[PDB]
Design a protein around this nucleic acid. Structure first.
Ligand SMILES: [Mg+2]
Ligand SMILES: [Zn+2]
Ligand SMILES: [Zn+2]
Ligand SMILES: [Zn+2]
Lengths: 528, 60, 54, 96, 66, 89, 189, 116
DNA sequence: GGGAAGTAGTTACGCCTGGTCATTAC
DNA sequence: GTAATGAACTACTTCCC
RNA sequence: GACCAGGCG
């Protein structure tokens, strides 16, 4: 029934896969008509998903909040070079024959280096060191050992321009540019039997796929549109870039079909290549970044995956959570070290789900009757089917009568519950510990004073966060592993970290100094 | 590190991703960071133990 | 003999089991949350779950 | 009405304590969570149609090996963004 | 993780003196957090290379021979 | 989007709140109805201005005026009394 | 084809049936998961018999329900293409005749009913041969070979089996007896 | 199907009659108004409809044609009991689906083994 | 060849307040 | 009225006379 | 939603 992901493999998408997985082809460089409905064939077509309420995705039915979206594709007029694989194409080109497709090596060397690649393949540095030797030794040879044929050096200029140096005469040579329609044909002829020597994999990484012919379009849900209160539409940067790409492609196709001098198509081709290169990555070396109407450089696919706000360090590693609270802290030495004071305002907002059993039916039924406005109470009840019902002033007296085994009640916090207490920055492992709840009338968190050192807290404006686990396994883990009294000894140096501080030493010295003496009433009062 | 995602999440993400795409690398999800990214339990602490139960139990 | 990780896992598993319909093996004062019932069962030494160790 | 952020050092602290189930609850259960249909034969994400309640893989004609996987929505977005470029991630399922 | 945190956390309370005394007895050598950064990062050549040279049984207890 | 009728409790028939009237969180200060949103036809949208969900006070003054291009404009102020308590700096 | 096959599987036992012995609880669970859900490659599940072996429970994180490795025997009826169907015509229809073959009703096309031209007589809502005077009515017991098989999903109703009916050795028992009389006449001549 | 298979056998509908009669009597003893679900009582009815000859006799016949000739497989033995053939054309049609066809003298012998 | 010299990659964690956007020539 | 874009650091890689 | 500026520990 329920499976888990076991492994992930990477590769390069072939044009067949792109053309098969796509749901629609985009031709029209527009998004919305005058009424507000998506334009058929545009970058906002319904077949790729729906966002605005009241619309249905005809690809999979669904609604505006339960459709995951579907892909699209664009048929490029002429192939272009992927910027990410730019250097690898150069390394491959300058280490293979120009007209047979074979590598610039003999059979003995091929066997010798295959016997070396066979072992130490699971490692990275060694496998990279091996590849560099092959490229270095095959770069120098100027004649193919497999077929008698002359060869010429190749110059690479960033980002996606390749030069070929050819001799017009013995002392006169001219540079020839290699257009992508030639690089793809050259790359298509390499046999798969020597691909592992170049470091590729014939099954799922083929050299001719690094030159794009069809470009996929991300679904609608990957680039949402926000409707401003002024009536104008706000669209993501990817939409604008795709519109520009589509317009340029359409103009190039029309010019090619209608006939034109070479100087026209050979410039539109460069413009399209620049647009695609900027679309994939907007910080490529040696290219003016695309600029928005406001002057801010656009964000693109490469920028969404890097930085402190990228998809990796921004959402995957850390994300915002649901059940939490934040407020100031104040001292309270009258509670034990493993308790924390919680305002009654917060305790009536955060809820702990509970399952009704035969040993707690009475308390739960009593709590439900109080409603959501008296302190001991609940906000929701869940029937065995799965429906969620809100407790109201016209529902408590009848919902408390339907309660039976198997139901779920989202009650308020009580004394005895366990919560997680945190202060940022989290420097070491003792910055998060579990405390027992104790409700107080005012609106600040109460903390015992001997617990200050591990938190490094001081009562001059500091704030702390509070988290509430929801599942019984999480509660058990917090109760057994994260208790305050279990972390008296510091793991850094094997000494006590929680202890007396400030007055706890001065009072002790005053009590235990020489000549100190007390009367009966003082002794009885202090002991009590 | 063998895991592609563990290295990619640290620094120079795009270069690592494209290199792994070229090499046809395989990630086995045997680490800690990758399992956190997916959402399945980590193998570090409590997620290491395994326990069994004898079913025919009755209240004593 | 149990390592604290094993103890926490066992207590969590039993606490989850109790809150779904499994009968309690010991008498408990009324109003007790299921986690406390599991803790009481563990300290009474009547927990039937066992751990397999390589 | 926003929520607090569980940063990366908080995850490292939770790891250092060793509470895996607490990590699962905090990082996944209280955040985005979804179910995705995965084609077992080819590794691509399957398609579910509401019009006739039929589930099939679009790229390859497979309709029996379709399975359900529970994952965070952000990782699905990451997979979609990787597929936006020519990189193809393939998923290999396992039991349990 | 515990070892990494136990190494990282105390570094935030690092102090620095940097006397820079002209005395040959006190060799000017970088110290503290920059030294820890150099050691952990495995710098190819340290900013202030230096050696400690001991003497054999002879020349050990004399000034002129040293 | 019509909220509960309890919130439109102390709005005068011209759409403006009476001064010196107590207001709680989510109470409506100015009632405004936007034109319908194209897909819902013939259905005006409720876009009233309301007090912040976690505030409380008493209305102090109401000002009516005209902007630089003919549109109407209203400004409302809320007065709240605060006594020292725990946590104040 | 009614058949008994031994199968290995892993059974989940919810907390409610913890007090009950593992064997019968596992039996009930297998009834629920297999009695309605059958496999095309194996046929249609009919009756689960006694389960002989069970293993210790494995508790996984999340569900908290015990999982047991189980080997059991199940009686299955598997239809095979090109097989002699023994069954009665449950109902008939202008595009085909519904034939009870097992857990599913089969469809005998009107082009597959006879060599002779057939017509759907509406007086009794039945089939009748043009020149043979042969008739098919609800409740008739027939034997026919299979030509086409089809099976879509684990719901039994969505299955169809096409039966050839002209081929020798098939038909209603009456005209089979007539063919036997013809064979006797030819062998005596 | 679960993990896989560990064995396989073939049965006659004469045996299927008493197999379904089992579930019949057990569920009536348990107090079920519908002791067999849909197509289960149907399977019982269809099995008993052609089950004049007893199930144990069907197994004995299976073993008799086991000893009679080596090429005979228990599936075919169950089939011949299930169909009750009487003449050459009957078994010719019966086996024409399978690759193997029945020899006429072996057919006469199966006529004797079929008995009632 | 081993000296320039020119790329190329990084630079702590939360939280709060307010203000501005999100084309134009005909 | 709308279609149209206009400062520090450190380690590699490339030279190179 | 993204930017800019200023504060708190
Ligand atoms: Mg402070
Ligand atoms: Zn859809
Ligand atoms: Zn060659
Ligand atoms: Zn597939």
């Amino acid at each position: 029934m329920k499976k888990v992901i076991g492994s992930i493999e990477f590769g390069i998408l072939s044009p067949q896969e792109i053309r098969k997985m796509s749901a629609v082809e985009v031709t029209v460089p527009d998004t919305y008509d005058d009424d507000g409905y998506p334009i058929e064939g545009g970058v906002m077509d319904k077949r790729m998903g729906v966002i605005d309420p009241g619309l249905r995705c005809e690809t999979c039915g669904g609604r505006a909040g339960e459709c995951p979206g579907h892909f699209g594709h664009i048929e490029l007029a002429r192939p272009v070079i992927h910027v990410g694989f730019a250097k690898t194409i150069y390394r491959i080109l300058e280490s293979t024959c120009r007209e047979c497709g074979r590598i610039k090596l003999t059979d003995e060397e091929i066997e010798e280096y295959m016997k070396k690649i066979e072992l130490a393949r699971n490692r990275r540095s060694e496998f990279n060191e091996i590849i560099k030797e092959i490229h270095k030794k095959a770069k120098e040879r100027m004649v193919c050992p497999h077929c008698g044929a002359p060869q010429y050096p190749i110059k690479f200029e960033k980002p996606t321009i390749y030069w070929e140096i050819r001799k017009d005469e013995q002392g006169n040579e001219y540079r020839h540019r290699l257009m992508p329609t030639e690089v793809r044909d050259w790359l298509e002829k390499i046999p798969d039997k020597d691909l592992p020597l170049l470091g590729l994999d014939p099954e799922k990484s083929r050299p001719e796929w690094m030159v794009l012919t069809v470009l996929p379009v991300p679904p609608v849900t990957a680039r949402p549109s926000i409707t401003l209160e002024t009536g104008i539409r706000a669209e993501d940067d990817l939409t604008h870039k795709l519109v520009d790409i589509i317009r340029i492609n359409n103009r190039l196709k029309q010019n090619i079909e209608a006939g034109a001098p070479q100087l026209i198509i050979e410039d539109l081709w460069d413009l399209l290549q620049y647009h695609v290169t900027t679309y994939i990555n907007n910080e490529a070396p040696g290219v003016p970044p695309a600029k928005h109407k406001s002057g801010r450089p656009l964000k693109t696919l490469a920028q969404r995956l890097k930085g402190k706000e990228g998809r990796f360090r921004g959402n995957l590693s850390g994300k915002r959570v649901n059940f939490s609270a934040r407020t100031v802290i104040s001292p309270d030495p009258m509670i034990s070290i493993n308790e924390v004071g919680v305002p009654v305002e917060v305790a009536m907002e955060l809820t702990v789900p509970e399952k009704v059993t035969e040993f707690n039916i009475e308390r739960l039924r009593k709590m439900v009757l109080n409603g959501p406005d008296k302190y001991p109470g609940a906000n929701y009840v869940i029937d065995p089917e799965g429906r969620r019902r809100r407790i109201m002033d016209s529902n408590k007296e009848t919902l408390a009568n339907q309660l039976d085994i198997g139901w779920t009640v989202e009650r308020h916090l009580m004394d005895g519950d366990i919560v997680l207490f945190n202060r940022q920055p989290s420097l070491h492992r003792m910055s998060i510990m579990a405390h027992r709840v104790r409700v107080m009338p005012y609106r600040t968190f109460r903390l015992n004073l001997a617990v200050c050192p591990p938190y490094n807290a001081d009562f001059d404006g500091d704030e702390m966060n509070l988290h509430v686990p929801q599942t019984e396994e999480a509660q058990a883990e917090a109760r057994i592993l994260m208790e305050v009294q279990n972390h008296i000894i510091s793991p850094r140096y094997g000494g006590p970290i929680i202890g007396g501080i400030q007055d706890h030493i001065s009072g002790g010295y005053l009590l235990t100094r020489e000549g100190a003496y007390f009367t009966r009433d003082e002794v009885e009062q202090m002991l009590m | 590190k063998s895991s592609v995602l563990a290295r990619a999440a640290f620094e120079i993400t795009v270069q690592h991703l494209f290199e792994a795409a070229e090499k046809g690398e395989v990630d086995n999800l045997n680490g800690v960071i990758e399992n956190v990214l997916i959402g399945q339990p980590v193998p570090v602490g409590t997620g290491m133990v395994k326990l069994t139960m004898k079913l025919p139990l009755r209240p004593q | 003999k149990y390592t604290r990780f094993e103890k926490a896992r066992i207590i969590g598993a039993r606490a989850l089991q109790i809150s779904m319909g499994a009968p309690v093996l010991i008498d408990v004062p009324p109003g007790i949350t299921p986690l406390e019932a599991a803790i009481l069962e563990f300290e009474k030494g009547v927990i039937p779950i066992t751990v397999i160790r390589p | 009405e926003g929520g607090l952020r569980f940063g990366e050092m908080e995850r490292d602290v939770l790891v250092g304590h060793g509470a895996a189930m607490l990590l699962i609850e905090r990082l996944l259960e209280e955040s985005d969570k979804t179910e995705v249909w995965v084609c077992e034969n080819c590794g691509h994400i399957a398609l579910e149609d509401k019009r006739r309640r039929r589930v099939y893989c679009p790229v390859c004609g497979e309709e029996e090996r379709i399975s359900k996987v529970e994952m965070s929505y952000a990782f699905k977005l990451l997979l979609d963004e990787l597929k936006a470029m020519v990189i193809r991630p393939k998923l290999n399922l396992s039991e349990r | 993780t515990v070892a990494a945190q136990s190494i990282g956390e105390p570094s935030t309370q690092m102090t620095l003196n940097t006397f820079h005394y002209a005395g040959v007895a006190e060799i000017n050598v970088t110290l503290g957090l920059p030294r820890i950064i150099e050691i952990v990062d495995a710098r190819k050549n340290p900013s202030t290379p230096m050696m400690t040279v001991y003497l054999d049984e002879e020349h050990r207890y004399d000034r002129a021979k040293a | 989007g019509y909220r509960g009728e309890k919130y439109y409790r102390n709005l005068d028939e011209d759409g403006l709140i009476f001064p010196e009237s107590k207001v709680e969180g989510k109470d409506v200060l100015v009632g405004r109805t936007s034109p319908p949103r194209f897909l819902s036809l013939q259905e005006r949208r409720e876009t009233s201005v309301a007090v912040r969900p976690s505030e409380k006070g008493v209305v102090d003054k109401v000002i009516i005026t005209e902007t630089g291009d003919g549109t109407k404009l209203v400004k409302v102020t809320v007065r709240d009394l605060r006594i020292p308590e725990l946590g104040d700096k | 084809m009614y058949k008994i096959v031994t199968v290995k599987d892993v059974v989940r036992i919810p907390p409610t049936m913890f007090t009950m012995d593992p064997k019968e609880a596992a039996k009930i669970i297998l009834r629920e998961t297999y009695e309605g859900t059958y496999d095309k490659d194996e046929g249609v599940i009919l009756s689960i018999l006694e389960v002989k072996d069970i293993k210790d429970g494995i508790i996984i994180p999340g569900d908290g329900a015990t999982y047991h490795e189980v080997v059991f025997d199940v009686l299955v009826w598997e239809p095979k293409i090109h097989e002699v169907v023994e069954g009665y015509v449950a109902d008939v229809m202008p595009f085909g005749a519904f034939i009870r073959i097992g857990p599913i009703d089969g469809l005998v096309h009107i082009s597959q009913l006879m060599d002779d031209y057939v017509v759907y007589d509406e007086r009794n809502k039945q089939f009748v041969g043009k020149e043979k005077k042969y008739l098919l009515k609800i409740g008739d017991l027939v034997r026919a070979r299979i030509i086409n098989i089809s099976a879509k999903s684990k719901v039994i109703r969505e299955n169809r089996i096409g039966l050839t009916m002209r081929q020798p050795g098939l038909g209603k028992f009456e005209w089979i007896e007539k063919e036997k009389k013809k064979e006797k006449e030819e062998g005596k001549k | 199907i679960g993990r896989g298979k560990l064995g396989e056998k073939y049965i006659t509908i004469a045996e299927a009659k008493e197999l379904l009669l089992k579930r019949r009597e057990e569920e009536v003893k348990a107090g079920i108004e519908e002791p067999l679900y849909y197509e289960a009582r149907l399977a019982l009815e269809h099995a008993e409809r052609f089950a004049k000859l007893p199930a144990d006799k069907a197994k004995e016949a299976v073993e008799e044609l086991m000893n009679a000739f080596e090429w005979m497989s228990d599936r075919i033995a169950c089939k011949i009991v299930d169909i009750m053939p009487e003449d050459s054309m009957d078994l010719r049609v019966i086996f024409a689906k399978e690759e193997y066809q029945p020899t006429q003298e072996e057919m006469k012998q199966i006529l004797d083994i079929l008995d009632k």
